[PDB]
Amino acid sequence: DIVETATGAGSFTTLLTAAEAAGLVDTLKGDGPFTVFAPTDAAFAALPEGTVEDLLKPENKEKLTEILTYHVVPGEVMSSDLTEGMTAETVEGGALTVTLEGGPKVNGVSISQPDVDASNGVIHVIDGVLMPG
């Protein structure tokens, strides 16, 4: 799924493509539904200053790698699947707030393009940036 992007990278050449290309192939698409809040290609270009330039370098993926756990979460179903108004705990150890009704958002960031269903799990697009690094 995410690793599949690395192979192609048509909408996530700036961050997801590096997922499998960063030695995460077996990690992200290892074996199970994996939720990754991957922002839209517009979000990356949206960031002002030299953050896009920083986000354009392969070194940025290395940072997310160290804290990949915060971005990686096994068995994570969309709140809408059960109830509206829950949280999102990351392997690393971070419980975020998943809100849908009265304005869909996550830990303060809106999932611009919520895909929900990934090629091998779950995927949600953030209009900005999430997780540390």
Automatic annotation (TrEMBL):
PROSITE patterns documented for this protein: FAS1
Pfam families tied to this protein: Fasciclin
UniProt keyword Ribosomal protein, yes or no: no
Keyword Membrane appears in the UniProt entry: no
GO cellular component: extracellular space
Occurrences of domain FAS1 (ranges): 1-130
Keywords: Signal
UniProt protein name: Beta-Ig-H3/Fasciclin
